[PDB]
Structures are given as C-alpha cells and as structure tokens.
C-alpha cells in the first residue's frame, strides 16, 4: 500500500497523487484525434475504430458541439465526456444570455479549468479521464485552439493531438507550414496524416471523420461528411496505400 | 546517455538502408530513450 | 505518523507532506528573481517552450492581478491558476465594501488565513504555490511580499524563486549593500545579471521576461523588446 | 469493508446471509387449492411457564389478504405496519379493493433502502430478514405469492419455507394436485407439519387459517384445531 | 462529501489515560523562540526574542505581540500562522461583546473564550487544535494581571513565567532572581538578562520586542527606549 | 490482492487504470435471463425467455410496458429495475403534459444515463447490474438501444443479453442481411432459433417460457404470453 | 467509500461494556482528594489542593470549589479543560427552572441532566465521551441537607459521607469506622476530615495551604455559605495535631502500664 490511492485530497512524496497520473495514462490508452488551426479557421479530425456491423452511430460519436458556435472533440471515456459537456453548454448559455455576448473560447476554458482543479483538492469526486479539444473562429479575434488536460493544465495551441499516436503526429504536424494554405487544403492534408497514421494502429478497419469551422462556415460549427470528405480520401489513396 | 541516442539513429538508417540520416531519426530516438528511463 | 489518510501533530515538528510541497513546486526548469528598488520593483522570469506547435502569446507566468498589484506565481499550474481566480474575486469585493484601494500586504495576509485552515483539515489539502506580490504603494512606497503555503508570508529586500533560490541569494546579498545607488535602468540591468549567472544562460530576446513596477505610475507592465535588448546590450559593453 | 459494496461476484452479501437466518426459524406452510388459500404455521412452544397463547406469526393484513411471515420476527413487525396502512389509504382514496399483488409490490419498494450510499436512500443500514407468503382472494380468485427477502415476489400455488424447506417442498409435491378438495388439503398439510416436529402435536403450537369467499378471512379456533387432529 | 470526514477526533483516550496529540503540542511549544513575562505589579512586562535568519526582510514587518484590545495584549510561543488566526477570531469577539456593553473588558472572560475555541476543536474532529501557548497580559485598575493559556485549554495565574526553547532551565533561573518590589524599568532589565541567559544569538534593538501594560494599559516601547535600557545595564 | 481495496473505493483507479466496479457489473448482466433484440427498422421484435424458480411456480415477467409506444426487456435483478422504471414513466408524463409530444426515445435514453453516471463519479452508489434492451417506435421509425449499468448507450440493429450472448450474435450477423425491411413472421422464426443458441441447448423449446413482444408501423405495445405465441409459431 | 478513516471507535466488543468508559476511571483516580462528610448539622466539604508554587497566585479561594447555586456547590474531579464547558450548562438549567417554577431547582433534578448528556454519546453521537465526577454539597427546605455524588458511568449516589480522589478504598474504610449513625455535629466533623486526610497524604507536614475547607450551614436565607480562611484552617490543624500527639501519648502510658516490653 502506497497510502495515497486512498486519498485524492492530500500531498504525496511525488507531490500530486498517483490517481491523477493514472488519469493521464488512460487518455493515451484511447484512440487518436488531431486538430489543426489556421488563419482562416480551425479543422478537427478524429479516428474511430469500427467494432462490428450490428452497431451504428446515432448519438454516440467522438465529435461534440458546444453551444452553436463552438466545436468540441475528446479522447478518453465517452460517457464522462458527455457529462462534462452538457453542463458546459448550459453554463455558457446562462452567460450568453446574461452578459448578451456570444461567449469567448477563452472564457469557456477558464470555467472548465476551475472545475477540474477543485476535484483534485478533494476525495469526494474522482476525476474525469478525458482530454477535451475546443476552439472555433471568433468573428473579431481569429481562430484559437485550446486543449484542456485532466492534469489541470491548459494552453492555447497551433496544433494539438492526443491518443496513442501523439508523439508521432506532432512530428509530422511540426514539419508543415505556419499558414498552411487555406482551410480547404488542410481538409485533404489532415486526411493523409490520419490515413498514414492508421498503418501503425491497423488491426481492424477505421472510419475517417472530419469537421471544420471555416470562413465559409462563417464561424459556425459543422461536420465535414459528404463528397468533400471522400475526395480528400481519394487523394490519400492515390499517394500511398498505407 | 546522449551517445546511445546517436547510435539509435544509426540503427534506423541501417534499416532504411542508407548511409544517409535525417532529422526525424534523432527526434524519435531521443523520445525513445526518454521513455525507457527513470 | 499517519500521513496515510490524515495529518496530525508529530514529534517531527513539521509534516512530511508540508515539506513535499516545498520541495517539488516546479516540474519544469524556470527560475525567477525579484528585486526591490525605490525606483522600481522588478521581477525577471523566462519564456521557454518545448515545441513550436504551441502558442507563446498567451503563455505567460506573470499575471496582472489588478492595475496596481502584480503577481508572479511559482507553483503547480493548476494550483497557481486557481488561486488567482479566488484572489481576483476577494480583491474586488474588498474594493466594493471598503470603497478604498486594497493594500498589497493586506491581500497577502488574507490569503494566508485561507491557506491555514486547509492545514487544519485532514479532509483537504492546501494549494501548492508560492506567491510573490509586488506593487507600488503610496503608503510606504513599493512593496514586495512573498508568501509560502505554510501560512508564512513576509516582506523582503529582494527574493528569488525556482529551485536554485539559495544560489541566487548569495549574489543578492552582495548586491543588497548598495542598491539605492542604482538608478532606474541600472536596477534592471543588475536584475538581469543575477539570473544569467545562476542559470548560466546569456539571454536571448525571446527567453527572458522582465516585468517591472514603476514608481510614480500605478503601472505593471512587461517590457517591450527594444527596452529589453537595450539592457542586454548594456551588460556586453562591461564585459 | 463497506456493506455499501456490490461485491466482486456482483451478488450482494447481505441478501445471502438472510436465507441462513431463515433456516433457523420455524416452518410455515401454504397450499392454495382451486378454491380457498390455506396457510398453516408452527408458532411453537418450549417451556411450560410460557404462554404462546399470546404469540402468533400469522396475521391478517385485511379481511381479504393475509400473510404468514418467517425469519427475524421483530423486523416483520415493522414490515406489516407500513403495509397495513398503505392498503387502508386506497380505501380512503377510491373506497375500493386492492390486489394481493399490488400490496406485495408496495412493500417490496421499501425493501430497498439499505445503505447510506447512493444506490438506496438511507434510513436503514440493512434489509428485512424475512420472507412472507402473501395470500389473498379477489376476482383473480385465490392466489399465493412468495415474498422473497431478495426484495422480489414470485407467484406460487404451493410453497413451504422454513428449516425443513428442502425436505418439505419434496413432500409437498406428491400431495399437491391442481384440483384437490380444500378440506382434504388441510389433512395433507397436517401430515407434513407432523413430520417436521420433534415436540408434541397439540393445538397449542400450531395454527391454521384459511380464506374462503363464503366467510372471509377466518383464523381457526382451538376447538376446530382439535377436530382436525382427530381425523388424521 | 461536504459533511463527511472524521466526526470523532484524532486525539483519543489511551489505556495510559493521556492524550497523545496534547503531549505532542508541549513539543510544538518547545520549538518557540525565547519568551518571558515579569509582572511589575503596577506595570506588566512581556518580552521575547525575534530570531532573524534572513537578512532579507523589511521594516519590522510582522510582530509576535499584537493588541487584542487597548488594554489587553497577547504574546505567545508555538506556531506563527496559528497565532495570527487566533488573534483574529478573538479580536473580533472582544470588540463585539464589549461594545454591546460600555464596560471595559475583564481579563478572565477573554481567557474563557480562548480556551473554549481550543476545547471545541478537542471535542470535534476533522480539525486539529492549535499548538500555541499564550501569555495574556493586561492592566486595569488595581486588579491582578499576567495569565497563561495552554494549548491544553487550561489557565493559570503567574507572577513570572518563561517560554520557548529550554523553558525549564530559564524558569529555574527566573525563580531565583525574581523577588519582591521592583520597578517597571527594573523589570525590563531583568527580562533582558533572563532572555540573554536562555540564549543569545545576539541582541540588538531589533532582536528584542518588549511591550508593557502600565499607564492606561498597553503601550508599545520605541526602539530607542529599549536601547537606552541595554546601555543601562548590558 | 487488494480485491477488497477496489471494492472499498468506488473512486478506484489502478496502474492499468481499470475500474473493477464496471467489471463486476458486467458479470451481473451475464447472470440474468436470455433476451434478443431484432429490428427490420419498420418492425421490431424481441423474443424474451421468462423463467420460473421451481415446478409449483409460474414464470416471472421480464417484458415491461413502459409506454404505449416504447418498451423494454430486463436481464438482471427485478428489484432495481422497478425503481428506474418509475423515473422514466414520469419523464414520459411531463413530456405529455407540457409538450404534448412523445419525445425521441433516443433523447430520453441519453438523459437517464447522466443522472446515474454522476453518482459513480463520486462517493456512494453501487452498480445497478441490470442491462436492458430498449425498443421504441419513434418518428423516424423504430430504433433499438442497449443501456448498460456502465451507462454504455449504443444503438444497434439487433443485439442480445444473457450468457452465451455471442452465439446468437454470430447467427444475427449471418441472417442479418435476410432481415431486410419486411416480413413479421420471418423475424420471429429467426428469434426462436437464435434464442436456442443463448441457452445451453440441452433444454428443449417450450411455449410457457418464451414470450414475444412486437411494435411496428401501426403497432404499439403488445405481448404474446404463454400459449398465445403458438398461433404465430 | 465515504468513511473508512475511522479506527472502529466507540463500539462494543466481547468486553460487554465499553473500553473508553473504562479508561476514564483511572484518570479520575489521579486527581487530588476531595471529601464530603454529611452531618445532622450542616455539610462539611474539604478538598486537597494540588501543585502550588510561589510564582503561582491565589485569585479566589474558588479553585476546586464552584458555586452552581446559592445553595449548591460542587467539587469537580477531572481535567480542567473539559469541566468548565460542562459546568456552564449545569448552571444554565437551574436558571430555566428558576424562570418558570419561581423557586429553586430540586438537587436530584440537576444531577439527572448530567447523566442524560453522557448516555446519548454512548448510544451514538459522533463526539468522543468525557469523564467528570462531582460531589454535591446541597440543601432543601423540605428534605433538609443533601449530599450526592455523580460519576460519568451514569451512576450517582447519595452519601452520608464519601470520599473520592486518591486512595479512595482506604479512605472509605476509615471513614466508615469513625462515623456514627447520626449523632454528628460540625465540631466532630472538623476533626474527622483532617484525620482521614492526613493518612492519605504522603507529605508528612500538613498545612492550611494544601487544603481547602468549607462548610454550608443554615441560619439565614436558605443557607449561609462559609469559605474557610487560612488562619482558621491552620488553627484546626494544629489543634488536631496536638490531639494526635495526645492520643499517642495516652497509648504509650497504657503500654507502660500493662508491663513494658
């Protein structure tokens, strides 16, 4: 006995508790999501592993919305992410009406940041084991991308990625342009990255999922399915087969 | 500790069948060693 | 004694758990230093990143608590950010209720009491952070107050932060004999110099982050590159 | 060591224990026949300076539903107070008859309150240690249910519960029939009740009751019990 | 939780019949910088030592003597944060109760309130008692003064006492030297001597803090004033 | 070891980050009865097995009329199930009072989930150890969901709970394509066959244990009980 | 879980009693001797004073003897800290009764309140128990003088004379002998206390400063409360000492008279 799995309201010889490290191991144990921000907007893309044919998606995904201007994606356990999220939209909404403004991305983050840190000080409520990726395009500020960790740490990003693949993805991402052309071009590019990432994950099929907040979307949050998803896929299939 | 990373990069080149290295082998090598460590 | 799910009085005289907060309070390699003059009070920090897939225009470890007051935090990030939010509310409230400005010292003492209770609970731990308060009072002049999360706070002639504090202390004492002989900028220069010796890094324009409090202004401002480079250049000329 | 635990098996600990407590009590017998329900019990005795005249364990909930209870007897005293009232409340509200089954459900909701956790709202730390054989007559005719300490109800036409239950139930099978006379039954019941005993067969440790449509819930008197003895 | 935790106390009856946590606090007390008190009868003297350990300090910033009221003052040995907090609650209670009435504070009543707060924490769990010992010093009329308050929750009257490191040894010195009629200036000379004997790391006009209760209660000595006494007899 | 440790913490996290509580919960679903779920997506059927503890008993129901357009089968202990069912009926009642709309069963299922999940996320609550196959005929057709006491909500076109669930799954995948968007009759036959796969299969088919329940385009909640399944056999 | 911090306190065991209850008793035993003698005239109360020094002060005679009423007083045996909390509630209930009933509270009723508090804790409360014993010196206007005793175990008694504190067994025995059923006056009692007190004391010298003595008598109001002064106490002691010397001397004369050894 270590004497501190039992707690979650105290210090340890490692400082923070073992329970908090573990929550960080579990997100990495999940699938793989990336995000790329640009000057015209921000793109989200996520890999979903296929289980069997019986099943079908219709309310359980991995891409989630916040409000009606905010895009949300996560790694970790599905049920818990959904629980965090329903409350966030609601908290955002009371603000939205009350101050009369359409909430910032930055303010939303602060509100979530504070919740998670409070749960680390107590042993009443075990933490979430998710990592949440959020961001959009603000009409007068730009695109801003943030990622919040279960480790009580959050930052503003040009790219962020999570999953088993994390290290490797950030390397490829790191290789590319700051501007990265136009958003549309990025839809194709992100698809190559996922396409190639899957050779490393391949034990069964996958489904490619892409989303966007674009200048053309006019800052709203929408999914990219349709022919648009398929072309980016064809371009990856031509280039390599991996 | 650094020497091992250098040699590590060198294995991946033999795998690639080149006497020619890239920046990538060093980035990956360094991370490989870091994890394995205390 | 039993640290296992409770904290008690011990013959140890301290607590293993309180020491552990003192010990790991940084998990990176930043170091900080703060000096006090009658011309300025300056805090010098770093800017560092691991990659460039990350932004650095929102990344900061210097907080503007309010117009007059500034706060640099050494602590776990989660804990540093929480405490700021709590403080921001408490200050504002003190302004509303009293109608007068909140003294720097007053905040440090109030916050200290909040730390202390948590030390009595064996159902909750204190936040892990050292908070350095700096400000310009019109009631004793500029004021520099450091807190530690034992409930201890005191005002100092200058102080240093990071894990190499004692090493920085040695330079500081030498310096602190004469410091009222420094004019404005020359305060700043010396302040850069003592972090560069410890840390053993001759700074670069995007690695350093000097924050200054200025007397005869209620400004806390982080300095522009031109001024920051002007100093850096200034030590070259004496080398 | 919580008792708020679900258990690694996933089969809660406390419920299992209750069955053991029950194996320690008496034997209670029910046969419901084509017309009428009979419930027979052992109320026992031990010493000569005792008055079991005083004692009972078969109660009428109302004049058309009854119950026999078995187990940690003090708990059943709590259990009945709640039920009896709830039935009576339905008469205030609609002045009408309740089903044996509706009554049995209501009491099973109350069976789950154990713990102070968040699967059960606390009031109790543990459950009722008793099983009950719930009888009644309505338009669905005479029926019998076995109230299981596992907070669940199963329907029955014949049942024994008690220490002797394993044997008794076997014995109960041969004598049971889908159609058999009510009076005939009472004699059949008497035979199983005789077999279990070590102590004397007298009308001062065993009790019969039946419900028939033509005369309501009736508790059987001593003089009546003595006659039943004579026949077998 | 938010109401769960430990309802019973950490402290517990022993087959010893002693209270473990309580025993530890005498140790907690022990660690304190040297303290003394002299009652000059017409006056009162309390004194202590400010240790110093970082040259980096400002002013004479925080004290170790704070006024509760304009007539009673506290000084202590034990843990500093506990002291600040202890003073705040009491200080609040002293003003509120004695502005209902216009009568000035009786000494015993303050002691009764400090001890209760200390005692409730012994009764209840989750929170631990404070591990400080106080010297309640005041002046009022012709009454007796100079009182001691334990982390135990107990009180006693004294003419003289000492706290801090090597408490037993200093008290034995104190016992012999302190007798009969003395003067307010005279009591100060003695207290410095008794503190020096306990330990001197040095004494300056900033290692010493002396306060008295005499004319119109508590008055704070100037730094020069004390220094005059150091020369008056080193 | 530390089996008792992992029971004692409902806030449990291990080196492998597993939560044992969920694990326990899964074993409890497998302890229950046998139930299948099937839909064409214009009709939906569920064959459910209702069993009896002994000879002199008669079978206990595991098909619950939750509403006159929505319904469930339970698989796991009877007592917890009753408690959940009241909450869901009342949630249907206010929908009718206030909104006068049936409300998507999809929307409903998701809401129930949260309220359970949050007490696992803190002190108290043991697992509820009943899994469900929830059916309902909504606006966009029938839909089928599996609710788990792990609050794992999934829509499937067919599913199964009960020991040897997998067996029947494999047959459902095989016959899957044959199901199409027609025939009542066919779905039931496959169900009767499929249900045989779930059982040990030494037990021969019986009309007193089986029970058939349908909802469909113009159908609402109907149960075929005992002998009543013989016409459709 | 939601509780697991505990050490499984304040529960029963095959002991068939309660461990914690038992523990307290030994601590009572430590504390300075207090004696109650009840007579047909008055009530004599004496208590033996613990540690006193010259740096220590006397601010009252009251330092073991506490007035709960203007006809009740008690000697408390137990740690100071607990006792002052308890004492205040006891004073307070008399005042309720005084408000309503408009005349003093019965002694027996006041003793009943203390046991009720304790008992609640032992069935269940969440707050640790305590342990205090009081010896009650009290009067009434239709039941005459009362002396009672309370213990934390929820057993209280009434006594003609009882003693508790250090050397409880020996003191009780001696007390039983010197006593006479009725036929007792204050003057007889003055001697009786000291004689028993000296035999329990280890310090061979006896002095008025190690003792506190008081009597509660009647004459006026309901009672006259007497707190005995140090010169008067010293006088009793010397007079008494001279009597022990005198007894011893008579005995030596009888031994010589039998035939010396």
Swiss-Prot record, chain A:
InterPro entries found in the cross-reference section: Ntn_hydrolases_N, Proteasome_alpha, Proteasome_alpha-type, Proteasome_asu_N, Proteasome_sua/b
Query: For the modification N6-acetyllysine, which residues carry it?
Result: 53, 202, 226
Lineage top rank: taxon: Eukaryota
Q: Which GO terms describe its cellular component?
A: cytoplasm; cytosol; extracellular exosome; nucleoplasm; nucleus; proteasome complex; proteasome core complex; proteasome core complex, alpha-subunit complex
What keywords were assigned to this record?
Acetylation, Cytoplasm, Host-virus interaction, Nucleus, Phosphoprotein, Proteasome
Induction cue: Down-regulated by antioxidants BO-653 and probucol. Up-regulated by bacterial lipopolysaccharides (LPS) and TNF.
Q: Which residues carry this modification: Phosphoserine?
A: 239
Q: What is the protein name for this chain?
A: Proteasome subunit alpha type-3
The record's listing under PROSITE patterns reads: PROTEASOME_ALPHA_1 (PS00388), PROTEASOME_ALPHA_2 (PS51475)
Instruction: State how it assembles.
Output: The 26S proteasome consists of a 20S proteasome core and two 19S regulatory subunits. The 20S proteasome core is a barrel-shaped complex made of 28 subunits that are arranged in four stacked rings. The two outer rings are each formed by seven alpha subunits, and the two inner rings are formed by seven beta subunits. The proteolytic activity is exerted by three beta-subunits PSMB5, PSMB6 and PSMB7. Interacts with AURKB. Interacts with CDKN1A. Interacts with MDM2 and RB1. Interacts with the C-terminus of TBXA2R isoform 2. Interacts with DNAJB2.
Pfam families from the entry? Proteasome (PF00227), Proteasome_A_N (PF10584)
Q: Where in the cell is it found?
A: Cytoplasm; Nucleus
Which processes are annotated in GO (biological process)? proteasome-mediated ubiquitin-dependent protein catabolic process
Give a yes or no for keyword Electron transport in this entry. Answer: no
Query: Which gene underlies this protein?
Result: PSMA3
Swiss-Prot record, chain B:
Q: Which organism encodes this protein?
A: Homo sapiens (Human)
Q: How does it assemble?
A: Component of the 19S proteasome regulatory particle complex. The 26S proteasome consists of a 20S core particle (CP) and two 19S regulatory subunits (RP). The regulatory particle is made of a lid composed of 9 subunits, a base containing 6 ATPases including PSMC6 and few additional components. Interacts with PAAF1.
Q: Where are the transmembrane segments?
A: none
Residue numbers of the full-length protein present here = 342 to 379 of 389
UniProt similarity note:
Belongs to the AAA ATPase family.
Identify the domain of life: Eukaryota
Protein localization: Cytoplasm; Nucleus
Protein task: Component of the 26S proteasome, a multiprotein complex involved in the ATP-dependent degradation of ubiquitinated proteins. This complex plays a key role in the maintenance of protein homeostasis by removing misfolded or damaged proteins, which could impair cellular functions, and by removing proteins whose functions are no longer required. Therefore, the proteasome participates in numerous cellular processes, including cell cycle progression, apoptosis, or DNA damage repair.
Put simply, this protein is called 26S proteasome regulatory subunit 10B
Curated annotation (Swiss-Prot), chain D:
Q: Which residues are glycosylated?
A: 189
The entry's cellular-component GO terms read: cytoplasm; cytosol; extracellular exosome; extracellular region; ficolin-1-rich granule lumen; nucleoplasm; nucleus; proteasome complex
Under the subunit heading, UniProt states:
The 26S proteasome consists of a 20S proteasome core and two 19S regulatory subunits. The 20S proteasome core is a barrel-shaped complex made of 28 subunits that are arranged in four stacked rings. The two outer rings are each formed by seven alpha subunits, and the two inner rings are formed by seven beta subunits. The proteolytic activity is exerted by three beta-subunits PSMB5, PSMB6 and PSMB7. PSMA5 interacts directly with the PSMG1-PSMG2 heterodimer which promotes 20S proteasome assembly.
**Role according to the record:** Component of the 20S core proteasome complex involved in the proteolytic degradation of most intracellular proteins. This complex plays numerous essential roles within the cell by associating with different regulatory particles. Associated with two 19S regulatory particles, forms the 26S proteasome and thus participates in the ATP-dependent degradation of ubiquitinated proteins.
Report which gene this protein is encoded by.
PSMA5
Q: Which Gene3D superfamilies match?
A: Glutamine Phosphoribosylpyrophosphate, subunit 1, domain 1
Keywords associated with the record: Acetylation, Cytoplasm, Glycoprotein, Nucleus, Phosphoprotein, Proteasome
Q: Which PANTHER family match?
A: PROTEASOME SUBUNIT ALPHA/BETA
User: Which CDD domains has this protein been placed in?
Assistant: proteasome_alpha_type_5
Modified residue Phosphothreonine is at which positions?
46
The molecule here is called: Proteasome subunit alpha type-5
Residue list for modification Phosphoserine: 7, 47, 54
Q: Reply yes or no: does the keyword Phosphoprotein apply.
A: yes
UniProtKB/Swiss-Prot annotation, chain F:
Tell me the compartments it is located in.
Cytoplasm; Nucleus
Q: Name one GO cellular component term.
A: cytosol
Q: Which UniProt keywords apply?
A: Acetylation, Cytoplasm, Glycoprotein, Immunity, Isopeptide bond, Nucleus, Phosphoprotein, Proteasome, Ubl conjugation
The UniProt entry, under InterPro entries, shows:
Ntn_hydrolases_N, Proteasome_alpha, Proteasome_alpha-type, Proteasome_alpha1, Proteasome_asu_N, Proteasome_sua/b
* Keyword check for Acetylation: yes
Q: What domain of life is recorded for the organism?
A: Eukaryota
Which residues does UniProt assign to the signal peptide?
none
Q: Which residues carry this modification: Phosphoserine?
A: 110, 177
Chain residue numbers at which the record places covalent cross-link Glycyl lysine isopeptide (Lys-Gly) (interchain with G-Cter in ubiquitin): 115, 208
Glycosylation annotated at which residues? Answer: 110
| Main subcellular location | cytoplasm
Give residues where N-acetylmethionine occurs. 1
Q: Which residues form a coiled coil?
A: none
| A biological-process GO annotation | negative regulation of inflammatory response to antigenic stimulus
**UniProt-listed PROSITE patterns:** PROTEASOME_ALPHA_1 (PS00388), PROTEASOME_ALPHA_2 (PS51475)
Q: What induces it?
A: Induced in breast cancer tissue (at protein level). Up-regulated in liver tumor tissues.
Give this protein's Gene Ontology molecular function annotations: lipopolysaccharide binding
Question: What does the UniProt record say this protein does?
Answer: Component of the 20S core proteasome complex involved in the proteolytic degradation of most intracellular proteins. This complex plays numerous essential roles within the cell by associating with different regulatory particles. Associated with two 19S regulatory particles, forms the 26S proteasome and thus participates in the ATP-dependent degradation of ubiquitinated proteins.
Q: Which PANTHER family match?
A: PROTEASOME SUBUNIT ALPHA/BETA
Protein family according to the UniProt entry: Belongs to the peptidase T1A family.
State what protein this is by name: Proteasome subunit alpha type-1
Q: Could you tell me which species this protein originates from?
A: Homo sapiens (Human)
Gene encoding this polypeptide? PSMA1
